[PDB]
Amino acid sequence: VKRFFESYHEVPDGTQCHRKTYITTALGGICGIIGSAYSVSLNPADSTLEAVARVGRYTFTAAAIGAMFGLTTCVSAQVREKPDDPLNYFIGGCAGGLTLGARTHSYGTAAMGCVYMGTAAALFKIGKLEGWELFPTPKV
Amino acid sequence: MNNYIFVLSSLFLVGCLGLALKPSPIYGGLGLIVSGFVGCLMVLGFGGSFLGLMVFLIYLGGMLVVFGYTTAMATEEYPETWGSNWLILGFLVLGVIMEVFLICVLNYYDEVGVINLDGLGDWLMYEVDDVGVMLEGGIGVAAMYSCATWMMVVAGWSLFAGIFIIIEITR
Amino acid sequence: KFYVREPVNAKPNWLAVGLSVGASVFMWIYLIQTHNEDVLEYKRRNGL
Amino acid sequence: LRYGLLAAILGDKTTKKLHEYSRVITVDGNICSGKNKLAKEIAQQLGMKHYPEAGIQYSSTTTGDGRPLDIEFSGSCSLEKFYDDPKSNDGNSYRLQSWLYASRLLQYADALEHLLSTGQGVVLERSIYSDFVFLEAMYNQGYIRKQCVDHYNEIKRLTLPEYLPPHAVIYIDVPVPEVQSRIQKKGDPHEMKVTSAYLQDIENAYKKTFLPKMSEMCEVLVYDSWEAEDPTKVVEDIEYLKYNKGPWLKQDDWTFHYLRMLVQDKTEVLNYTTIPVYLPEITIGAHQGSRIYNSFRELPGRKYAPGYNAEVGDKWIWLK
Amino acid sequence: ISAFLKNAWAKEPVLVVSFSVWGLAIIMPMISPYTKYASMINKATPYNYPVPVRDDGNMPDVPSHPQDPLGPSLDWLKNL
Amino acid sequence: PFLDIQKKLGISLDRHFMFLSAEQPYKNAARCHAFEKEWIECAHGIGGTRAK
Amino acid sequence: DGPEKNYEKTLAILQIESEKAELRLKEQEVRRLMRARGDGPWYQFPTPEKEFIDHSPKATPDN
Amino acid sequence: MPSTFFNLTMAFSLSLLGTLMFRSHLMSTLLCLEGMVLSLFIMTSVTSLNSNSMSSMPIPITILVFAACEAAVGLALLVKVSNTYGTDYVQNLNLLQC
Amino acid sequence: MMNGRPGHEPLKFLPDEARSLPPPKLNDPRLVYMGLLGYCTGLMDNMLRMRPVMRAGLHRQLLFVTSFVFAGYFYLKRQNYLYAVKDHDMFGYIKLHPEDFPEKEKKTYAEILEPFHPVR
Amino acid sequence: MNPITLAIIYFTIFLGPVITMSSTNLMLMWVGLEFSLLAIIPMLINKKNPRSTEAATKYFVTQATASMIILLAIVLNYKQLGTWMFQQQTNGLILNMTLMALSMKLGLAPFHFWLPEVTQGIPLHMGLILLTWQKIAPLSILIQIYPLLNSTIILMLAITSIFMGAWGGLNQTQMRKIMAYSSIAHMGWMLAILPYNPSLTLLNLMIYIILTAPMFMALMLNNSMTINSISLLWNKTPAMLTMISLMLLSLGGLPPLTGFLPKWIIITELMKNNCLIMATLMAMMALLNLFFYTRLIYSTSLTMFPTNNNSKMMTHQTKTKPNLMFSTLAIMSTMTLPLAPQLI
Numbered sequence A: 001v002k003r004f005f006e007s008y009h010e011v012p013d014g015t016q017c018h019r020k021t022y023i024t025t026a027l028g029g030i031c032g033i034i035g036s037a038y039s040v041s042l043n044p045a046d047s048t049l050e051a052v053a054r055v056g057r058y059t060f061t062a063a064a065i066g067a068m069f070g071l072t073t074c075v076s077a078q079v080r081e082k083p084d085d086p087l088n089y090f091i092g093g094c095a096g097g098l099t100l101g102a103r104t105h106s107y108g109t110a111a112m113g114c115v116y117m118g119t120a121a122a123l124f125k126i127g128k129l130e131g132w133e134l135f136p137t138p139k140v
Numbered sequence B: 001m002n003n004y005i006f007v008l009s010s011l012f013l014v015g016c017l018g019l020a021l022k023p024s025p026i027y028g029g030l031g032l033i034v035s036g037f038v039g040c041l042m043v044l045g046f047g048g049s050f051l052g053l054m055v056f057l058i059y060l061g062g063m064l065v066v067f068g069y070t071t072a073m074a075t076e077e078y079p080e081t082w083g084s085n086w087l088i089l090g091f092l093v094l095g096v097i098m099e100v101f102l103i104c105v106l107n108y109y110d111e112v113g114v115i116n117l118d119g120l121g122d123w124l125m126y127e128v129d130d131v132g133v134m135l136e137g138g139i140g141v142a143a144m145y146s147c148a149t150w151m152m153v154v155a156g157w158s159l160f161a162g163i164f165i166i167i168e169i170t171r
Numbered sequence C: 001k002f003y004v005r006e007p008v009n010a011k012p013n014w015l016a017v018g019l020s021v022g023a024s025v026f027m028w029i030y031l032i033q034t035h036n037e038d039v040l041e042y043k044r045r046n047g048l
Numbered sequence D: 001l002r003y004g005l006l007a008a009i010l011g012d013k014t015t016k017k018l019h020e021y022s023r024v025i026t027v028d029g030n031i032c033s034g035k036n037k038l039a040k041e042i043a044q045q046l047g048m049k050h051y052p053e054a055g056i057q058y059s060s061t062t063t064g065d066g067r068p069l070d071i072e073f074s075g076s077c078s079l080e081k082f083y084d085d086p087k088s089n090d091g092n093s094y095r096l097q098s099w100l101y102a103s104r105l106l107q108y109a110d111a112l113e114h115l116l117s118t119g120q121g122v123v124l125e126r127s128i129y130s131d132f133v134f135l136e137a138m139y140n141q142g143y144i145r146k147q148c149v150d151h152y153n154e155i156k157r158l159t160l161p162e163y164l165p166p167h168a169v170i171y172i173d174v175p176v177p178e179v180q181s182r183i184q185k186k187g188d189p190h191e192m193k194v195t196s197a198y199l200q201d202i203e204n205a206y207k208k209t210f211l212p213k214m215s216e217m218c219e220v221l222v223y224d225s226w227e228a229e230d231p232t233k234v235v236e237d238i239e240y241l242k243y244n245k246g247p248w249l250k251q252d253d254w255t256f257h258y259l260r261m262l263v264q265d266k267t268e269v270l271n272y273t274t275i276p277v278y279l280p281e282i283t284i285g286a287h288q289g290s291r292i293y294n295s296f297r298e299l300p301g302r303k304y305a306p307g308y309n310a311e312v313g314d315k316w317i318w319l320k
Numbered sequence E: 001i002s003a004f005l006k007n008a009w010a011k012e013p014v015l016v017v018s019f020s021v022w023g024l025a026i027i028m029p030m031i032s033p034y035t036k037y038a039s040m041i042n043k044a045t046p047y048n049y050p051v052p053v054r055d056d057g058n059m060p061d062v063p064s065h066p067q068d069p070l071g072p073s074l075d076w077l078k079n080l
Numbered sequence F: 001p002f003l004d005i006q007k008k009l010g011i012s013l014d015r016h017f018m019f020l021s022a023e024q025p026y027k028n029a030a031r032c033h034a035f036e037k038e039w040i041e042c043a044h045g046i047g048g049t050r051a052k
Numbered sequence G: 001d002g003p004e005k006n007y008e009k010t011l012a013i014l015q016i017e018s019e020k021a022e023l024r025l026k027e028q029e030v031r032r033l034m035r036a037r038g039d040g041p042w043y044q045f046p047t048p049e050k051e052f053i054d055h056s057p058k059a060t061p062d063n
Numbered sequence H: 001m002p003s004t005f006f007n008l009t010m011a012f013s014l015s016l017l018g019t020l021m022f023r024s025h026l027m028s029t030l031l032c033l034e035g036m037v038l039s040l041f042i043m044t045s046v047t048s049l050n051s052n053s054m055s056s057m058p059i060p061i062t063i064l065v066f067a068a069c070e071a072a073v074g075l076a077l078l079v080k081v082s083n084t085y086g087t088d089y090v091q092n093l094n095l096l097q098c
Numbered sequence I: 001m002m003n004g005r006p007g008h009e010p011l012k013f014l015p016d017e018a019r020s021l022p023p024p025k026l027n028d029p030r031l032v033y034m035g036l037l038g039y040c041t042g043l044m045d046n047m048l049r050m051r052p053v054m055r056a057g058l059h060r061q062l063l064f065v066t067s068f069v070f071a072g073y074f075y076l077k078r079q080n081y082l083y084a085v086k087d088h089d090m091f092g093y094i095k096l097h098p099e100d101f102p103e104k105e106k107k108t109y110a111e112i113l114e115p116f117h118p119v120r
Numbered sequence J: 001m002n003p004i005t006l007a008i009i010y011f012t013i014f015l016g017p018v019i020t021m022s023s024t025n026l027m028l029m030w031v032g033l034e035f036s037l038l039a040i041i042p043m044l045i046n047k048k049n050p051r052s053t054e055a056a057t058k059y060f061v062t063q064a065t066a067s068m069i070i071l072l073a074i075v076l077n078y079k080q081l082g083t084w085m086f087q088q089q090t091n092g093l094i095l096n097m098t099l100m101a102l103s104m105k106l107g108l109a110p111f112h113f114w115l116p117e118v119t120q121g122i123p124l125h126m127g128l129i130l131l132t133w134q135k136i137a138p139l140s141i142l143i144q145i146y147p148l149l150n151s152t153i154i155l156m157l158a159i160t161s162i163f164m165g166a167w168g169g170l171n172q173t174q175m176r177k178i179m180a181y182s183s184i185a186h187m188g189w190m191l192a193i194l195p196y197n198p199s200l201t202l203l204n205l206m207i208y209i210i211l212t213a214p215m216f217m218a219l220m221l222n223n224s225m226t227i228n229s230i231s232l233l234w235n236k237t238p239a240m241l242t243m244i245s246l247m248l249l250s251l252g253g254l255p256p257l258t259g260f261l262p263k264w265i266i267i268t269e270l271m272k273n274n275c276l277i278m279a280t281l282m283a284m285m286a287l288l289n290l291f292f293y294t295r296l297i298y299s300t301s302l303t304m305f306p307t308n309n310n311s312k313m314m315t316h317q318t319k320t321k322p323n324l325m326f327s328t329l330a331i332m333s334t335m336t337l338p339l340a341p342q343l344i
């Protein structure tokens, strides 16, 4: 449902923490399922058991990225009550990388994730705050 | 009687679904002829006689070569039928049950429009011209020789060129 | 030195020379009138 | 009108030029079997063009001023060094053989273009088809590491299939104890020090692989030393051969055109012989290679395409 | 070429009749006197009703009654 | 189209049976001939983003 | 030549480049309206041709 | 008309779903292309007959002229596939991996 | 974007309306460049085939200098016309709709209170 | 092949795009695509070796299915509006299936896998046609429906073409596979600007053609198929080195050369549509496409690799291969940036 994912921007950050965690968790879970499908097709497993296990591994891993991203961004707004601040998504986005490296066993992905996922996350709130529009309708 | 085209289309879908499951090519051709034979009928039901017998006179000749080719290249010690694999049979009954679930469920959500279960047969001909000659379907195809001659040259060339294309591949 | 294999370019391809040099002069000639005819046309239309 | 699709369309088909004696005839044998005398007589009697065996300096006598070049340009292999020290740390043995194969492959190309151009027969001697015997003989004695036989069979695999085997191969048998006495009598102090075992492997490399394999695609004719002398009879045997069981039968008019185009373009003939397989024995290196190539271009008749080199005296440069 | 034409006639007649009739069908339409009548006969057949046209006092050449002598006629078809 | 060669030469190779009201083989009006004749007249010169 | 030349050349450069700046912005703002509303010569997307409509009376009255 | 086209379009989809999810044969995939064109031919035929578009009747013929030529080329390819592997299988066309 | 403009002839190089513009001077900074490139093309043709450069193809190089300049003049003329049509429509459209491009009157620097940002 | 067959097969390739461009019926546009499919197959199998056969089969089944998805779009439109043209007020689903299938023909990601596979199994020629000539006919379909394509999938295809074309080609040793991953990379750009001012789509197509053709010719001088083989180019024919280096740099977006003009002007036009975010990501990854070109310039021109002894046989003979269009195309690319206003 499109209207469901639209609720993420209905309230300022921190308000309705539980709802925003669910939205991110589902959003990340979808990304895992979409991504996990390619791995099942390209470079397939040796059997269906290993194929579903791979699907579960990515979907739950990706779902973890959304949850910890949502929890950290939402909690960081309740304390330091400044909802319109891109720094919150950076810390929130950073926690995703730390979570990411927790599943994939290597610190390199953990340290890199914070810089990239956090930087991408922070830029996202700048876009919605400054009105950046990706996929613009052609107007010239 | 009203549910006459619907039954043909459903058999066309079931025949094509059986061809989608991809059994050994011998039975794929048999299924394809069943769908093609049904394809001729529903075309006839729409007032068109010439086109109907053409899909059933060109694909028939095609399957002989496919039958010839499959027995020459695509064969196994034990060819696969629709019931050799229980999974294929499982997706065959599921597919048959799937359409009924889709056909039925679409009806309740949308009263009419894409599918009209309540009103069937009423919406098939759309105002034939009761009085008139030269209306028989197939005169339009004959326009390929007059005021539609571009379709004639391009289609004719593909058959012309194709003979050269086939020889080079099989050289 | 005196080549064991006679070079493909032992002599000028005089056919190419005439057409190459000829087309160059024709192209230069057809370019001069076009400029002097378009310029003259430009004066006629927009005035002086 | 460089030969191409245009020439064939206009009436330059090859099948109309072939005659009864438009046959490629290679003469094969051992080190001193006496092929030059038998080969030259075959040419004169049957009106074919003799092609002396491709040595180290073949490309030098085929392109440019027509004289041998400095040994650093025409390969880096010396035949005399091979007999003196075949087990040299520098891979002079394999460089000699691979260089000779590329040379023969170039000569075999020239002969086919001659047959496919004017129809005059060509009588080679020890063409590429019989040139693997030496390397198989070199490997048996240990003059080559196993890693280079594989390279040789790879170069052969890529280039050999696209050429037509010779119509008839003449093998003049000479037993090892006879050739070893013949080598000493020819008076080349560098070649009189070749062991009998090396000569044997050339004989074995002929009767085990070459002789059977060619009979499946050519008409073989085995001859003895006493038959070769006064070779008018070997010519008569060729004059009355029935030619079947070979790829020449199934060559159409256009299959010649595509073979003719490939043979005509020498770079397209030798491209697969210069594949970047980094054998230490064959790699030249960026510093020696730049010196040889730069020094090669600084020669009379070189530095420009054959028609344009002014130092020779070619004229009308400003129109070509 | 007389031998070649009749030698093929003697050995492979089927490929000579095919080429002969192939050229005969191409050339016959140009020479026949009735070739132009193939089009007119297919203009005579009135598959659709001949729609009448109003009169404004300036439509003299079209007939008033169907059986009148001032319109197109098929009298050449009866005698073809 | 991408190349107006047909218009340039004036020859209608395949642009006389684009739509239903396109001079059927015999004078048989395609179903909904009047309606689309009306629509095509409305959207002429007025082009694309003004005829929608 | 002295300060006169460079001073009055720079002035010419400035207007040659202020006019370009003004025109470029009007080019952007003109195209924005033309595509939104096809009121101008540009962005006239194709529409089916009108000359191939057949106008002669047909078989049935109600064409 | 409305009820039958939903069945024809899904007939194409099932045939489309068949030419994508390959199986252990390459004749079968070419047969699936036949069904896709079979669905496309009838849709054009019904629509032309439904709308009484006798000027559009030539189009469905031309689809068959070209779709069947794809089969002619497709079948000729499959001759070369078998003459180099002798099995027609699809997992033998993995030699371009590198 | 100008393809559908009214009075646009199809697949025609220079419309009859395009001759009402000044033709290129034939020594323009960019027609000489086409000739200079053409010379560079001719020099490199000789370079790629081991021919002497600046010496071998004095009839090929003459052909390239003329072919590029000859082509450049006609292509340059077309572009001069295309930019003429773009400006012709751009200003013409501006007249018809004053309500979209009002003649705004800017305010002199005496009145506007532009802010100040000290450096310290 | 023989001249009669060669004439008919080539003449069929030429009618493919010509019919697609000239015709107005989308059906004749589709019939133009079929000739390109059918006529290409015999050439790809001209060698008659196992690699070629596998190349032709993948090409055939990938484009045969694509030719059917487009046909569904055309037939469904005939149901909806009764015309054979993609007019306005058409279902976006019908049109999305079009760009979906047209992407398969072009070779854009995520439908790109078939292209690098196929080009590996065919000679250096027939890669030039497959990557330049065959990719014009599908584009002509989209140029005539440019004010209808969805702004989202049109870009989401362009982005993954840029990435999957750069990342994939970042580790290709085989030259033919590199030239395929450059087509994907550059066809992200032509499709990226398709809804926005399509005129630049052709500009980046023409510039791309002017570059690959000399590159493919540059690899046809010696049938150099790998980075190692082209690393020997200095010993065999060093003349190309000056312009293999420039053309390869130009293909990457370096300012002085005329491959930066496409990336530059495309970024300008997107930047005029409030498209900040997607020009940065698209432009940032373009530099990656300049990496494996820079890797190739090291191997070939700047730093020179070890050669073979037999290579001294190639220098003796004379060459007459370059068809004189290598030179003219090599300078039209790598220069003419001063002539940018005449291009736009």
Ligand SMILES: Nc1ncnc2c1ncn2[C@@H]1O[C@H](COP(=O)(O)OP(=O)(O)OP(=O)(O)O)[C@@H](O)[C@H]1O
Residues within 6 Å of the ligand: D029, D030, D031, D032, D033, D034, D035, D036, D037, D053, D079, D096, D097, D100, D131, D134, D135, D191
């Ligand atoms: N591929 C090769 N590898 C190594 N040595 C070779 C090779 N080919 C030829 N040689 C040597 O080169 C010399 C060639 O002598 P060859 O037998 O060709 O003499 P000839 O003058 O042609 O006639 P003949 O020896 O029959 O009297 C011999 O030393 C032979 O051993």
